Paper text:
The initiation process is best understood in the bacterial system where the conserved ∼400 kD catalytic core of the RNA polymerase (RNAP or E, subunit composition α2ββ′ω) combines with the promoter-specificity factor σA to form the holoenzyme (EσA), which locates promoter DNA and unwinds 12–14 base pairs (bps) of the DNA duplex to yield the transcription-competent open promoter complex (RPo). The results also reveal functionally relevant holoenzyme interactions with duplex DNA just upstream of the −10 element and potential protein/DNA interactions that direct the DNA template strand (t-strand) into the RNAP active site.
The −11(t) nucleotide is almost always a T, being complementary to A−11(nt), the most highly conserved position of the −10 element. We also identified another conserved σA aromatic residue (Taq σA Y217) that plays an important role in the promoter opening pathway, possibly by stacking with T−11(t) orphaned when the conserved A−11(nt) base flips out.
Author numbering:
A (entry chain D): 1017 to 1238
B (entry chain F): 324 to 438
C (entry chain D): 2 to 57
D (entry chain C): 2 to 56, 62 to 1118
E (entry chain D): 1356 to 1505
F (entry chain D): 622 to 791
G (entry chain E): 2 to 94
H (entry chain D): 905 to 960
The structure:
């Protein structure tokens, strides 16, 4: 029931390596030249760092601050560009009317370990969710028909099926496969995900999507 | 003063690289929207408070303010337009005017615009 | 008078440019040092570029 | 009372931290130094170098320069909007090479700004600051080729603007093509005029091998020194003819000329001891009787080719190495502009000679003022390192003038920053603060000078290290440079210092900055104090070693954002520095000797000094500062007593009792109070407003000149044509407002009145005038009102009439006025506030003293901050700051905990054990006992483990007490809290940004003259920007018309924005827009490039963009 | 993204790429007015070929063209987009020379054009929507019989 | 830049619903001047437009008469509140104007996350959707209470904040 | 959380279609000063004010609650735009 | 114990099995309640809450 | 294509880059103004040289 523990453990504030440098040790620091140092920093922030540990830390710390703070601007370089190429993308035809489509695996081969395992939950959700079926599906009794709108439930159903080895490929409607001129279509796109329902026809889907990809931009340093 | 040349609108203001000189200048050339309505208001409110004037002392009260053809019409000509004399129109304006002053001081509808 | 759904852009010709113009400004004098009013040929000229005061 | 801690006693105190500004500027002044013994460096270098000015000719030489007496004191300037500058006279002699006319005359230069005591200058009444510039020290250097790893490219470089770049690159052509001033050419082309032919080219080169081939060339070496002197000159200058005498002059002036090439004394020094040579002047070569001998190029070239070989000792140099990087100081900077700005007059001298009356012209007609004067003022105003002084508080100016700017005209930019000049070199240490830097995109650019760090005339920042021998503390304090430091073994201030010797075998040490636990005896140096490892503000944070550097940075910078309070109070937990802070900042007035306070007089504090003389120091009580927070000297000295020399007399704005007092120590409960303190938010008790805590006063400047237009001038009076009765209230004589009058936003200050531009009133308006009868008078109202949101009271009444003594106004302007307006502001809702540990926040509402999580003693908490931004920001210092506060408030004694050396867990634990042990006395003694609610909480803890079971509540509440926590009730309910909540005194501060100012909203205001868009900032009174990101955000949702209004109706569109006000005023719906008017601009704009702007409609047809306008 | 912990959805990313490769290169123009090595959007070539098959002519042969997002945005049919984008100098020339007609196909072009955006509520799909209350609705429901007999 | 708009710092909304935002009095006044000018036209007190205009535009003398009158045009229509940068479309959400004291601006703590907000002194701006059409847009697809799911995930946005989580968990 | 939201969105297909309907109707409610509406004095928007509790003048809300009944008709190509302004701006002043 | 994730799943499942306004109110309920729920406990952070493992 | 070589000069309207005074007594001008100025100066002096019969250089 400790406040610090529960704090991050519940999902409020804090992360594991962050707690480590509080109740534990702060961990060996890195040199700005890029080669990590050869001496640890031991004592936690609660214990307090000696002048050395603190300076030696300040190296890669004040370094990192500059890393993130620098990439902040780079986010614009990404976003703006993505905007200028997505502006002309809107959902016009409800029906694009193409037999074209693409399939995604529910398993990603672990390199050098071979043996295709499975994509973690969020991963499958990362493009099966809110989709629209391209073709018939048969597994474990009840079969999906042509056209159904995949929901967070349907996705899990696909997982269950995949484990049964009855399904691997997932035929869906992609923006690529869409014949909607200067934009996409209902089927080819999907749920409005902010409404968890089919995207409103006339929506800024591409244009919105740009923002969707751009927002995470300042958050990837590594 | 004369000697001193003009000033480039691209001259940076402050110490930061954003601010421009020209972007710091207002536009009073065109009447502001607040003035669009302020003026269009008086142009009407003076039309309704005018109708309480005789068919002569009104249509004539406009000709002396450049309200009619936009150019001002002197007393001499107004008296020629109504068939009256360079004297009659003169008193007409006086009385017609203050006769409106009573309606103004009693309705407070136009009592603003005193700048 | 007509819904504008289209806007093109292209090159212009010396003639078309002559048409766009209301006159040929010559003198470098922006405005007088005294009257600060548009010079005869001044860049800011009020003679062929239209009045600074509405209808006046 | 007070209590100190730690066993690390600073041996040597902190040097005058304001000297890096003052002293360094003093060298370049030499005001007292006679015009003989002047050091020739700095200001006398501008004369030494730019003289004699020659042309049967003229030999005009330099003699002296008279140090001017300030015309107007630093005060007069600040109130006259004039620069604090003094006429610098100059004495010289004009002679002729033939006539022998020795004609001498004392000419005059211009006016040079003078520095104050603190280290800031005065520019047009606004005080500014000259920061420091950083770059690799001049000299020679060697680094691997950025285009190839297999070799090593070297280079040479003097002081900026005092000489051109130098580098000898090795192209992939196998030859060696040196590149200087952006162009390539083989080394032979140099050696030609250097006195080294084909023979001398192979003499010592064979000690290399493959390096003897890349140099030798027959197509060149057949050309002796004056023979090919012109050859390289042709490639150098495509314009001027390849004359044999032009290459005798130009190229010469670029090398052997110490006046056009100033190779900094450091460069002439540092480079001298590496390469193994004797270079005399600041030159490269020597103009020795005709051809040009070599003092530099060969001795560096052998090193360049030595490293690329692998021979021991010749190696790459560290570019970021502090020992290789000098600092441009105030005098060293100002002098830089004095010289070039003097040469700009040197040519103006040589030109005014070749004509007129060559017989005898006094140098008075020859010399000029403007070419020098304006050249200096240029740097003293529009340069980078000349920035607006920070007076937001006393510490502001201190740190501000103590910062190091990597920027400036002179060697870096926002582009080549990537890591190198951003990151922190291993040797930073006791030179520059590894943390305190702008948190913005400028990180690692503007740093701050370390405590004991000093910058000598050589630019090599040096750090104190207490010398030690045989493991014994020596009283010999060495200022060892960032260079030498990379040689010896430096111990640490936290080393086992006992009985003036080393205790434990394993001692803290390092070489070049690499941690090593080595034997005691071998310790040649040590760290004087941990304080030097950081900057000023950095060392103002207690238990800072517990706070992650990240937020600690903000904690250090925000020290400046903080604002003084009339009633403010020094932190009950200090580091033992803040004392001197107020002294060295010169923000406090002490006694020059041992005085005797005679008459306090909150204006004039007199102290009859022991020296028998009677001296008094007037007080600055309540006077405007560069931002809002005034300066105050609160007399703390009784109307008589004998003071001590150096003892304080009158306080300062952030200075309480000679201590740095930013905010006021306040008890804070760490807990989620109704989600009000959620996510670095703040909560405050009304009880603070009662005692007027964190409340300040802000003065502002309001000026207006009586404009003299073409239509004719005007005046500031009380008369106004349409003005009403009351609106004239405090105008009493000349149209000014009396002192101490409240001006709510919307009121006025002065009386400006000018003839309106005469224009016939609109017809409706003409009749409107006739009806009522107030005529349209010649003159219309002008007078300057007060800004929307700065309600003050008038204090400074400053009038300046044209035609008065010591006032020169603008050319053709009448009387002006600058009125001061001051206002008291209590802590408002949403005002920025932070602790010393770098935890930002805005006051979220307030809270009735009635409802408060008080304690058994009936003392309600005054703030209550949520424990959210503690773990993520790792601010564990604030935890101790408040933890001590618990015992602090109870025992009434303050603390001193130096950074990294201070009170620890056992110590604090004891202070809290005593705190509780005494607290119980005011309970059981006062006739009370253990409360039931207390039992509730105690039991809960006994279940959680916070209090060991089997122990009575007396022991449990005690253990919970030393934990920093206690039993808190709820002033809203009265029931206690399930868990305990830490509390106690903490140092916090109300930051600069206050909603009282920033917050703004407009309806329909002015617009940019160009396009009908509004105006950014609350200043010009305009709306915010909807820039492209916002537009896209709208496109996302799919709100069309919302975007329409943005692009047209609610922004720019001509008839649209008006039709809007029309509709809304008439209670209806606004029509859909048409012409954005900005776009209309774009049309003709493109047309100016002969771009036919063809607008089509619904089917490929003409459209008239500009309604009936340009249709000709 | 999944590495850094971003729950981002495939659709978006897909649209992007769709824009990247949506252009093709002209190879053996066949019977068309095109030239070997010219470039244009997938829909254009697809259309012209679809028509060519009916006209009897041989379809235009081609090969996929994968370019960068920037380059794509600068090659888009709408000249306005690239005009407001960047490298403005080069863009305007290329447009003006051939006299490029922007129909405001995209939104940003309309943004600058200060007109009703073809997307959102402004979408030509719903912007023509009508609204009537019962009373007035059945008021106008009768009027069509006032023009048939008269 | 636009007309009818402004900015200020931010303050948490512990009593505030998803569709709510604290809007300062003195702010909302000059923000809604064109509207209130009509609601004052209708509701007696000053005879006409200019009357009310100069009436309130002068001094600080705002009587309760104009307070309630202002609230009459406030209820219903909701104003858009934005926080820079505009990265996620959620960086702009529509909320119901709530006349409140003080200077700073309130807001729902759950949506602040989508705005990348924290109360360090952050400054948010505000605009007003004038035309009925646009206003409608503001209250429906543009409204905050409406879009609760992240368009880049499908997962919620207005999900419990760092604090609330700690409470419910506890 | 405008009442009937779920039902509102659920009525039409897209979001925009709905917004457009609410828009045009809300405007129509203003052009006729509320004497058009298909609702009843109990159903009409109610704004509670200290002075008196009147009908909420907000057009938007008017249209909002208006569609919830369904008495209103919509969709493209409904009736000729011509006679739609002859029998609309006539029946009400 | 209902922590972040569980709450998340609750929000989704609700918004899908219920509707916009309904779940809108639901959220605010957990907000207003959670704030006070946390308030009563208060759960402060002391230096002694940072306790170091004996295995260090 | 010959249009690329232009005889006329499309001169932008005056009010699009004006010169207007501000408070304090001094005026302010756009950059494009002085640019256009240098343009006509050379343009006129050229004519002056032409009819003059000045040499090729
Ligand atoms: Mg912030
Ligand atoms: Zn499709």
């Amino acid at each position: 029931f400790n406040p610090l523990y529960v704090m991050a453990q519940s999902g409020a504030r804090g992360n594991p390596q962050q707690i480590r440098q509080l109740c534990g040790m702060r961990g060996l620091m890195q040199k700005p030249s890029g080669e990590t140092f050869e001496v640890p920093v031991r004592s936690s922030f609660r214990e307090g760092l000696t002048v050395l540990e603190y300076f030696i830390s300040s190296h890669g710390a004040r370094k990192g601050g500059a890393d993130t703070a620098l990439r902040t601007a780079d986010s614009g370089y990404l976003t703006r560009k993505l905007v200028d190429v997505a502006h002309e993308i809107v959902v016009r035809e409800a029906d694009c009317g193409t037999t074209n489509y693409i399939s995604v695996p529910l398993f990603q081969m672990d390199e050098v370990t071979r043996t295709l395992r499975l994509r973690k939950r969020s991963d499958i959700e990362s493009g099966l969710y809110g989709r629209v079926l391209a073709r018939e599906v048969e597994a474990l009794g009840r079969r999906l028909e042509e056209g159904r709108y995949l929901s967070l439930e349907d996705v899990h159903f696909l997982i269950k099926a995949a484990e049964a080895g009855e399904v691997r490929e997932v035929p869906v409607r992609s923006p690529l496969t869409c014949q909607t001129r200067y934009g996409v279509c209902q089927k080819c796109y999907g749920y409005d995900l902010s409404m968890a329902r089919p995207v409103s026809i006339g929506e800024a889907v591409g244009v919105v999507a740009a923002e969707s990809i751009g927002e995470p931009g300042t958050q990837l340093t590594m | 003063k004369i000697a001193q040349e003009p000033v480039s609108l691209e001259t940076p203001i402050g110490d930061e690289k954003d601010s421009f000189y020209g972007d710091f200048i207002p536009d009073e050339n065109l009447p502001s929207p607040v003035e669009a309505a302020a003026q269009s208001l008086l142009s009407e409110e003076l039309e309704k408070a005018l109708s309480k004037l005789s068919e002569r002392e009104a249509m004539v009260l406009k000709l002396r303010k450049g309200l009619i053809d936009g150019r001002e019409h002197t007393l001499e000509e107004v008296g020629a337009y109504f068939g009256v004399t360079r004297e009659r129109i003169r008193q007409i304006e006086n009385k017609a005017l203050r006769k409106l002053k009573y309606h103004e001081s009693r309705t407070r509808k136009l009592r603003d615009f005193l700048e | 008078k007509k819904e504008v759904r289209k806007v093109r852009i292209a090159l212009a010709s010396p003639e078309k440019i002559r048409s766009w113009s209301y006159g040929e400004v010559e003198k470098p004098e922006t405005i007088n040092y005294r009257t600060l009013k548009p010079e005869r040929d001044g860049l800011f000229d009020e003679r062929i570029f239209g009045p600074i005061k509405d209808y006046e | 009372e007070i209590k100190r801690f730690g066993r690390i006693r600073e041996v040597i105190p902190l040097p005058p931290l304001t000297e890096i500004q003052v002293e360094s500027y003093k060298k370049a002044l030499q005001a007292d130094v006679p015009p003989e013994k002047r050091e020739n460096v700095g200001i006398q270098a501008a004369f030494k170098e730019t003289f004699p000015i020659e042309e049967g000719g003229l030999v005009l030489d330099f003699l002296e320069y008279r140090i001017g007496d300030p015309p107007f004191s630093q005060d007069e300037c600040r109130e006259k909007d004039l620069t604090y500058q003094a006429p610098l006279y100059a004495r010289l002699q004009l002679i002729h090479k033939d006539t022998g006319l020795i004609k001498e005359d004392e000419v005059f230069l211009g006016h040079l700004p003078l520095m104050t005591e603190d280290g800031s200058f005065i520019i047009n009444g606004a005080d500014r600051v000259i920061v420091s510039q950083i770059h690799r020290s001049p000299g020679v250097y060697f680094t691997p080729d950025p285009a190839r790893p297999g070799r090593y490219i070297a280079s040479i470089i003097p002081l900026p603007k005092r000489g051109p770049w130098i580098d000898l690159e090795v192209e992939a052509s196998g030859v060696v093509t040196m590149k200087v001033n952006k162009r390539k050419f083989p080394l032979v082309l140099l050696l030609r005029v250097l006195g080294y032919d084909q023979e001398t080219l192979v003499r010592e080169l064979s000690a290399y091998g493959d390096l003897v081939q890349g140099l030798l060339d027959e197509a060149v070496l057949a050309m002796r020194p004056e023979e090919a002197m012109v050859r390289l000159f042709t490639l150098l200058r495509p314009g001027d003819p390849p004359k044999k005498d032009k290459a005798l002059a130009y190229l010469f002036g670029l090398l052997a000329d110490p006046k056009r090439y100033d190779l900094g004394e450091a460069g002439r020094y540092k480079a001298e001891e590496k390469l193994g040579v004797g270079l005399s002047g600041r030159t490269l070569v020597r103009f020795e009787d005709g051809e040009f001998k070599d003092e530099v190029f060969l001795p560096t070239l052998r090193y360049l080719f030595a490293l690329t070989a692998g021979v021991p000792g010749h190696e790459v140099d560290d570019i970021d190495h502090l020992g290789n990087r000098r600092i441009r100081t105030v005098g060293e900077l100002m002098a830089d502009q004095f010289r070039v700005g003097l040469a700009r007059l040197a040519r103006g001298v040589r030109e005014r000679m070749v004509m007129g009356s060559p017989d005898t012209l006094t140098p008075a007609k020859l010399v000029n003022s403007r070419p020098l004067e304006a050249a200096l003022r240029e740097f003293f105003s529009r340069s980078q390192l000349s920035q607006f002084k920070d007076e937001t508080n006393p510490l502001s100016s201190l740190r501000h003038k103590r910062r190091i700017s990597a920027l400036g005209p002179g060697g870096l930019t926002r582009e080549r920053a990537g890591f190198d000049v951003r990151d922190v070199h291993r040797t930073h240490y006791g030179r520059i603060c590894p943390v305190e830097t702008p948190e913005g995109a400028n990180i690692g650019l503007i740093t701050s000078l370390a405590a004991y760090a000093r910058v000598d005339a050589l630019g090599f920042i040096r750090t104190p290290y207490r010398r030690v021998k045989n493991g014994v503390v020596t009283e010999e304090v060495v200022y060892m440079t960032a260079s030498e430091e990379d040689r010896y073994t430096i111990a640490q201030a936290n080393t086992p210092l006992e009985g003036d010797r080393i205790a434990t075998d394993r001692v803290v040490a390092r070489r070049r900055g690499e941690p090593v636990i080595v034997a005691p005896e071998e310790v040649e140096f040590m760290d004087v104090s941990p304080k030097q490892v950081f900057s000023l503000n950095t060392n103002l944070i207690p238990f800072l070693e517990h706070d992650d550097a990240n937020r600690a940075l903000m904690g250090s910078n925000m020290q400046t954002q903080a604002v003084p309070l009339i009633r403010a109070q020094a932190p009950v937990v200090m580091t033992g520095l803040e004392e001197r802070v107020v002294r060295d900042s010169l923000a406090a007035l002490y006694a020059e000797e041992d005085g005797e306070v005679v008459k306090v007089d909150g204006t004039r504090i007199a102290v009859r000094y022991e020296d028998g003389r009677l001296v008094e120091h007037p007080l600055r009580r309540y006077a405007r500062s560069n931002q809002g927070t005034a300066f105050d000297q609160r007399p703390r000295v009784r109307v008589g007593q004998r003071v001590k020399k150096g003892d304080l007399l009158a306080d300062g704005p952030a200075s309480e009792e000679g201590f740095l007092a930013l905010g006021q120590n306040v008890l804070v409960a760490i807990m989620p109070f109704d989600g009000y303190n959620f996510e670095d938010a703040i909560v405050i008790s009304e009880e603070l407003l009662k005692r007027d805590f964190y409340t300040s006063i802000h003065i502002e400047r309001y000026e207006i000149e009586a404009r003299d237009t073409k239509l004719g001038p005007e005046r500031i009076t009380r008369d106004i044509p349409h003005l009403s009765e009351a609106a004239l209230r405090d105008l009493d004589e000349e149209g000014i407002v009396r002192i101490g009058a409240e001006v709510k936003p919307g009121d006025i200050l002065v009386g400006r009145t000018s003839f309106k531009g005469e224009q016939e009133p609109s017809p409706e308006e003409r009749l409107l005038r006739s009806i009522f009868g107030e005529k349209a008078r010649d003159v219309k109202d002008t007078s300057l009102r007060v800004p929307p949101g700065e309600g003050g009271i008038v204090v400074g009444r400053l009038r300046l009439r044209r035609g008065d003594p010591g006032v020169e106004l603008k050319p053709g302007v009448r009387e002006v006025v600058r009125v001061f307006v001051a206002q008291k502001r209590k802590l408002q809702v949403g005002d920025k506030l932070a602790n010393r540990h770098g935890n930002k926040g805005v006051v979220a509402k307030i809270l009735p003293v009635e409802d408060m999580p008080h304690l058994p003693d009936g003392t309600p908490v005054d703030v209550i901050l949520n424990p959210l931004g503690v773990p993520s920001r790792m601010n564990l210092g604030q935890i101790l700051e408040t933890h001590l506060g618990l015992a602090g408030y109870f025992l009434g004694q303050r603390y001193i905990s130096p950074v990294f050396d201070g009170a620890t867990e056992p110590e604090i634990k004891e202070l809290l054990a005593e705190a509780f042990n005494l607290y119980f006395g005011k309970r059981q003694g006062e006739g009370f006992g253990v409360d039931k609610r207390e039992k509730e909480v105690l039991a809960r803890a006994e279940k959680l483990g916070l209090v060991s079971p089997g122990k009575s509540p007396e022991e449990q509440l005690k253990e919970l007490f030393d934990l920093g926590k206690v039993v808190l009730y709820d002033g809203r309910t009265g029931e206690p809290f399930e868990g305990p909540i830490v509390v106690g005194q903490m140092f916090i501060m109300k930051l600069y940004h206050m909603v009282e100012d920033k917050m703004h909203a407009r309806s329909t205001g002015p617009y940019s003259l160009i396009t009908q868009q509004p105006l950014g900032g609350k200043a010009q009174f305009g709306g915010q920007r909807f820039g492209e990101m916002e537009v896209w955000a709208l496109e996302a949702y799919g709100a069309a018309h919302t975007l329409q209004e943005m692009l047209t109706i609610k922004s720019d569109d001509i008839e649209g924005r008006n039709a809007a006000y029309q509709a809304i005023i008439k209670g209806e719906d606004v029509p859909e827009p048409s012409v954005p008017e900005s776009f209309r601009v774009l049309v003709k704009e493109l047309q100016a490039l002969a771009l036919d702007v063809q607008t089509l409609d619904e089917k490929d047809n003409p459209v008239d963009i500009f309604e009936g306008l340009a249709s000709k | 993204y999944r590495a850094q912990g971003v729950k981002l959805h495939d659709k978006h990313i897909e649209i992007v790429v769709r824009q990247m490769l949506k252009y093709v290169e002209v190879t053996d123009p066949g019977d068309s007015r095109l030239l070997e090595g010219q470039v244009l959007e997938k829909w254009d070539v697809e259309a012209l070929n679809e028509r060519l098959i009916a006209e009897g002519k041989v379809p235009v042969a081609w090969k996929p063209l994968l370019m960068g997002v920037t380059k794509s945005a600068l090659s888009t049919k709408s000249w306005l987009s690239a005009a407001s984008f960047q490298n403005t100098t080069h863009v305007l020339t290329e447009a003006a020379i051939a006299g490029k007609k922007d129909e405001l196909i995209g939104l940003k072009e309309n943004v600058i054009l200060g007109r009703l955006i073809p997307a959102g509520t402004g979408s030509d799909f719903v912007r023509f929507t009508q609204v009537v209350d019962q009373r007035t609705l059945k008021a106008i429901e009768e009027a069509r019989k006032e023009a048939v007999e008269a | 830049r636009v007309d009818y708009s402004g900015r200020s710092v931010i303050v948490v909304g512990p009593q505030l619903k998803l569709h709510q935002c604290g809007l300062p009095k003195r702010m909302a006044l000059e923000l809604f001047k064109p509207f209130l000018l009509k609601k004052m036209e209708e509701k007696a007190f000053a005879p006409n437009v200019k009357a009310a205009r100069r009436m309130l535009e002068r001094q600080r003398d705002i009587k309760d008469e104009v307070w309630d009158a202002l609230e009459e045009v406030i209820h219903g229509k909701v104003v858009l509140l934005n926080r820079a940068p505009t990265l996620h479309r959620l960086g702009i959400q529509a909320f119901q104007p709530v006349l409140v004291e003080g200077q700073s601006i309130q807001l729902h703590p759950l949506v602040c996350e989508a705005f990348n907000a924290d109360f360090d002194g952050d400054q948010m701006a505000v605009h007003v959707p004038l035309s009925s059409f646009a206003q409608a847009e503001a209250r429906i697809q543009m409204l905050s209470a409406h879009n609760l799911l992240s368009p880049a995930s499908g997962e919620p946005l207005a999900k419990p904040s760092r604090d609330i989580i700690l409470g419910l968990y506890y | 959380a405008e009442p009937g939201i779920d039902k509102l969105f659920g009525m039409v297909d897209s979001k925009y279609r709905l917004t457009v309907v609410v828009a045009k109707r809300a405007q129509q409610l203003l052009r006729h000063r509320f004497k058009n509406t298909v609702l009843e004095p109990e159903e009409r928007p109610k704004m509670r004010t200290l002075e008196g509790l009147y009908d909420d003048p907000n057009a938007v809300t008017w249209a909002m609650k208006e569609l919830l009944t369904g008495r209103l008709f919509f969709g493209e190509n409904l009736v000729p735009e011509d006679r739609l302004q002859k029998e609309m701006e006539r029946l009400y002043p | 114990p209902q922590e972040k994730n569980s709450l998340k799943d609750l929000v989704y499942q609700a918004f899908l099995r219920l509707g916009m306004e309904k779940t809108a109110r639901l959220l605010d309920a957990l907000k207003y309640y959670g704030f006070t729920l946390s308030t009563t406990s208060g759960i402060t952070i002391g230096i002694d809450d940072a306790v170091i493992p004996e295995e260090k | 294509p010959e249009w690329m070589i232009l005889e006329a000069v499309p001169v932008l309207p005056p009010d699009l880059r004006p010169m207007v005074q501000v408070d304090g007594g001094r005026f302010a001008t756009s950059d494009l103004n002085d640019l256009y100025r240098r343009l006509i100066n050379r343009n006129n002096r050229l004519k002056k040289l032409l009819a003059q019969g000045a040499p090729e250089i």
